[PDB]
Design a protein around this ligand. Structure first.
Ligand SMILES: *Cc1cc2c(cc1C)nc1c(=O)[nH]c(=O)nc-1n2C[C@H](O)[C@H](O)[C@H](O)COP(=O)(O)OP(=O)(O)OC[C@H]1O[C@@H](n2cnc3c(N)ncnc32)[C@H](O)[C@@H]1O
Ligand SMILES: *Cc1cc2c(cc1C)nc1c(=O)[nH]c(=O)nc-1n2C[C@H](O)[C@H](O)[C@H](O)COP(=O)(O)OP(=O)(O)OC[C@H]1O[C@@H](n2cnc3c(N)ncnc32)[C@H](O)[C@@H]1O
Ligand SMILES: C/C=C/c1ccc(O)c(OC)c1
Ligand SMILES: C/C=C/c1ccc(O)c(OC)c1
Lengths: 550, 550
């Protein structure tokens, strides 16, 4: 297909057309769409960033290809080398507010690993793990579980929504909410297609499965994995798996994820914190409850305007234009029966044990006047708790998609710095974010996700994507928070395409010794800069910093 | 000094003699020793392999060098890059049975990082971590904790002795036995002198500490870390930390290890399994208890002789010269009130929790005939339990050093296959290890140690170093052991100087993709291969494989 909307760098129109011809040849014209439209969460766009803060046709693909299998991805890559055509690998492209399936480099070949590469490849009950291809969602897998009666032997671990790729997410080092909440950490045995074309699997994945008659002459892609590939991550020698998450080192095609066995008892809960400044003493309570394994999962500390947005848009609470006042938020609390901060957690295992954690935790949160403890049953039926009951046992919902609609034309954008598990420090980060949010005229909407020693601060910027003034006011908001938080010793853990460069430029100890060392290894494995140039600030030698950096 | 027994390759006497003169002018004479003796554990040697299977002077330094600071380390890397001089950094060189201090490539400059770089830079009671330089033995840290009263707040995680470098062990991916027994996975934020000699700090350690007066003008080494540096492993971008374990990618100057807080209750236990065959059912029982979290640490399953040999050498049991027979093992067992296998574990936390777990466990092991339960107090003054009851609470000890003296000239080498947590697999490996020890006319000594989903199975080969026929026999054993276990889908997780190239060739999936990838990265980062060429089987392009491997 002839004249495209944006071409990749240095490439003539003639060369685009010969390139696509061989791709159309290899994949069949079903699995190639040249771009010469915004959609929804349910039929996700693979051309552009749906929750856009820049121009809509800023981060935009030139084509989209859907490899049917692993050798298609070798062919396509071997090809992209031949021309020097940037690629952008996506699994499901539901990386929304992080840019979705937009390419950082306008003119790229967004690579739809997900549309066809689809298989739940294995579920191992005694190993308590599973192998996933990029197309398997959280829901896909969940529906694999229930169709096989495995729901009663192994539980999953899920983000706020079920659309996401199991692997795409894990590679992004993302976060769920059971004891198995640290997604990346739960990986074992990765299969990666390298920039050069050569296939790789890491860990004991490199320890070959012993030869047998039934497996002879099977393509590397389709071979089985040795018995320990997915039980020990490290294998032998340097442990490279992590070079491949939040990186442009490769294209991931298979990934082992560990699964938590049915604990033998479950109960979720909600403790409500009446005042705004109850954050500080809360976190101070969570601190040695987390560190001492009285809090087994990854709990959340939701802000009121987060649940408020799930149960109904802004307009149905106030007709005001500025962000809502402190007294107005108080009303919304007593309205919905929530506090200013809500702490959502869950207990796991046999009744004898849940009993004691609960008595400890209740008993710990008693030094806060006005507190209140809820099990799911005790709430409204629309309730967030009633949904999150499901999220903390590995049952994927979509309910939470709604908070995106806090403002006319729904679009989000994340700022996720990292703070200490101290009440003091948590307050500080909230006061620094809150301040810059009013200056920008937004509301503050957020959650802290409690890791053992660290805390993920998710600043949920919603804006209406057809207000040309506010989208710039967000652009200014975003650039200031990164800076402000750096000035204060916090950095983001993940970002949107437009802010990769800054955020990485944030981590500049000893004159960017981290980036310079990364740039080194990139140029070594990808001599031609074709795998996802730009990702996480990391530019190859043939993308000039000046022309490219944002 | 003028004349060492061995020169590093392609290096002249006159060059060597400049390098040395040059080296001496930096670090003073007291800190530099040419070599023109096996030492102890109490004062480890730094030139060669103390428990040496190969020739006594097969792995040999040409000199030792102790930098008084990171700037020295830097200065040295500088010279070595000029002269193309192999380095071989050790922290403490206690790596016996993996080669102690000995350098993969003879003629290397052993960098004794520990002698002067020593300090415990930090114990952070909120963070439940600590920050350690290459010289901080376990024991050293232990005594530090004591002299600052922290013993009733933060506990350590020790491996079977106390000499070990807190960090040297960590970047070997070593293993101890509290619930924080996965040492490598407890690191957050490491510092590193790269091969080029540029200084790098990883993870959050890349986000610098914000400017204030009191730190202005400090050399990069002596700059503090930013707040989240040792609480969140990951930073932002591609996670490179792993690159620096069991690899030769950098020289490590500092590291942050998580410390586990006093858990508010502690009980250890011995479970004796009376039959050789009980291992099989025994592991099956472990599988669900491990994975459902009833077992909180790295319990281990020790072969009986282990305890035998801690208690008194081979002679003290029979003047027999060949391996002791099955029946003598039944004899010895009963003699010491032990089983044919031995399970050691611990209970952490309040009395109510301990209670419940310990019943779940008693009960589950009861299905094995003639099983018997002992607490510390229930056993004789000299017991292994009484020793491990210490080990399991982060207290360093050394009694276990005895087993090394099974034979006239004690020396141990290790073989370290990973294994499934399934009895049938476990027995398979036992069979195969055992048959082979039998054929080399050796006494089988092993443990498995219980990972979450895997088991580290440490075949403990011990032979007498002055016996050339035995030495040679042990070199046939290991090489056979690596091969057989590969042929049945089991890799070794860590090895000895003289088996590194072999073990790697074992992880050869898809025409060795793993090593080829790793050889690529290593040349990028170390053009003149001065850092530890050879480690883990990974070689620079100037070390021809034909010349160098084994
Ligand atoms: C708007 C939204 C997002 C969200 C969320 C709630 C809302 C309402 N809650 C989340 C949660 O609690 N936990 C979490 O981790 N993320 C949450 N999000 C963010 C996001 O939408 C989801 O996490 C989603 O699962 C991620 O998108 P997806 O799973 O569909 O993956 P992707 O679009 O392909 O993005 C991956 C990025 O990484 C690189 N990448 C991805 N896959 C590969 C493979 N196959 N090979 C090589 N590189 C890959 C890409 O460069 C891409 O940028
Ligand atoms: C014989 C013995 C050994 C032993 C054991 C019981 C007996 C009696 N029990 C162990 C166990 O419980 N768990 C475990 O992990 N190991 C056990 N061992 C083996 C050994 O004693 C320990 O592993 C010990 O901790 C290792 O010695 P050490 O800590 O001194 O390590 P090293 O000698 O200094 O060198 C080890 C390797 O590390 C790399 N290294 C070290 N420092 C650096 C720096 N800073 N920069 C870059 N690399 C570094 C080197 O490659 C070296 O090969
Ligand atoms: C809202 C949920 C969410 C969004 C983005 C993230 O990265 C995340 O991880 C802690 C959580
Ligand atoms: C027996 C003890 C032991 C020795 C060496 C090791 O590497 C190890 O780690 C599992 C354990």
């Amino acid at each position: 297909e002839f004249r495209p909307l944006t071409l990749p760098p240095k490439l003539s129109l003639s060369d685009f057309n010969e390139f696509i011809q061989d791709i159309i040849r290899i994949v069949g014209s079903e699995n190639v769409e040249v771009i010469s439209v915004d959609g929804s969460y349910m039929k996700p766009t693979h051309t552009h960033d749906p929750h856009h803060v820049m121009d809509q046709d800023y981060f935009l693909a030139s084509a989209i290809v859907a490899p049917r299998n692993v050798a298609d991805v070798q062919s396509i890559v071997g090809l992209a080398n031949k021309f020097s055509f940037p690629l952008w690998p996506i699994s499901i492209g539901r990386n929304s507010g992080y840019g979705g399936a937009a390419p950082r480099v306008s003119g790229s070949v967004v690579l739809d690993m997900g549309k066809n590469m689809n298989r739940v490849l294995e579920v191992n009950v005694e190993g308590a793990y599973c192998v996933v291809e990029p197309g398997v969602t959280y829901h896909d897998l969940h529906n694999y579980l229930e169709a096989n009666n495995l729901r009663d032997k192994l539980w999953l671990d899920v983000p706020d929504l079920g659309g996401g790729s199991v692997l795409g997410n894990a590679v992004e080092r993302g976060v769920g909410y059971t004891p198995y909440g640290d997604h990346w950490m739960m990986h074992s045995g990765m299969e990666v297609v390298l920039a050069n074309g050569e296939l790789l699997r890491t860990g004991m994945g490199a320890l070959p499965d012993p030869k047998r008659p039934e497996t002879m002459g099977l393509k590397p892609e389709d071979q089985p994995w040795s018995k320990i590939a997915h039980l020990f991550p490290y294998g032998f020698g340097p442990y490279i798996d992590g070079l491949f998450s939040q990186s442009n080192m490769g294209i991931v095609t298979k990934i082992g994820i560990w699964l938590m066995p049915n604990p033998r008892g479950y109960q979720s809960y909600l403790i409500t914190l009446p005042k705004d400044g109850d954050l500080k003493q809360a976190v101070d309570i969570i601190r040695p409850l987390r560190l001492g394994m009285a809090l087994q999962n990854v709990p959340t500390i939701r802000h009121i305007l987060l649940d408020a947005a799930v149960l109904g848009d802004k307009r149905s609470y106030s007709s005001r234009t500025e962000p809502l006042s402190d007294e107005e938020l108080d009303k919304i609390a007593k309205q919905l029966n929530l506090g200013r901060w809500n702490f959502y957690g869950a207990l796991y295992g046999p009744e004898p044990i849940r009993r004691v954690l609960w008595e400890t935790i209740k008993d710990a949160f008693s030094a806060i006047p006005g507190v209140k403890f809820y099990f799911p049953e005790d709430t409204p039926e629309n309730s967030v708790l009633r949904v999150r009951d499901k999220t903390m046992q590995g049952i994927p919902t979509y309910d939470e998609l709604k908070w995106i609609d806090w403002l006319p034309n729904g679009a989000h954008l994340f700022f996720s710095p990292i703070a200490k598990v101290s009440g003091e420090d948590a307050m500080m980060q909230y006061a620094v974010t809150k301040k810059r949010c009013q200056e920008a005229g937004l509301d503050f909407i957020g959650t802290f996700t409690v890791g053992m020693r660290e805390m993920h601060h998710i600043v949920c910027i919603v804006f209406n994507k057809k207000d040309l003034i506010q989208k710039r006011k967000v652009q200014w908001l975003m650039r200031t928070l990164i800076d402000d938080c750096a000035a204060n010793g916090w950095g983001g853990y993940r970002t949107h395409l437009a802010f990769m460069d800054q955020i990485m430029e944030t981590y500049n100890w000893n004159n960017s010794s981290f980036l310079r060392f990364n740039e080194v290894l990139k140029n070594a494995v990808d001599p031609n800069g074709i795998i996802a140039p730009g990702k996480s600030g990391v530019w190859p030698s043939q993308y000039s910093h000046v022309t490219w950096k944002l």
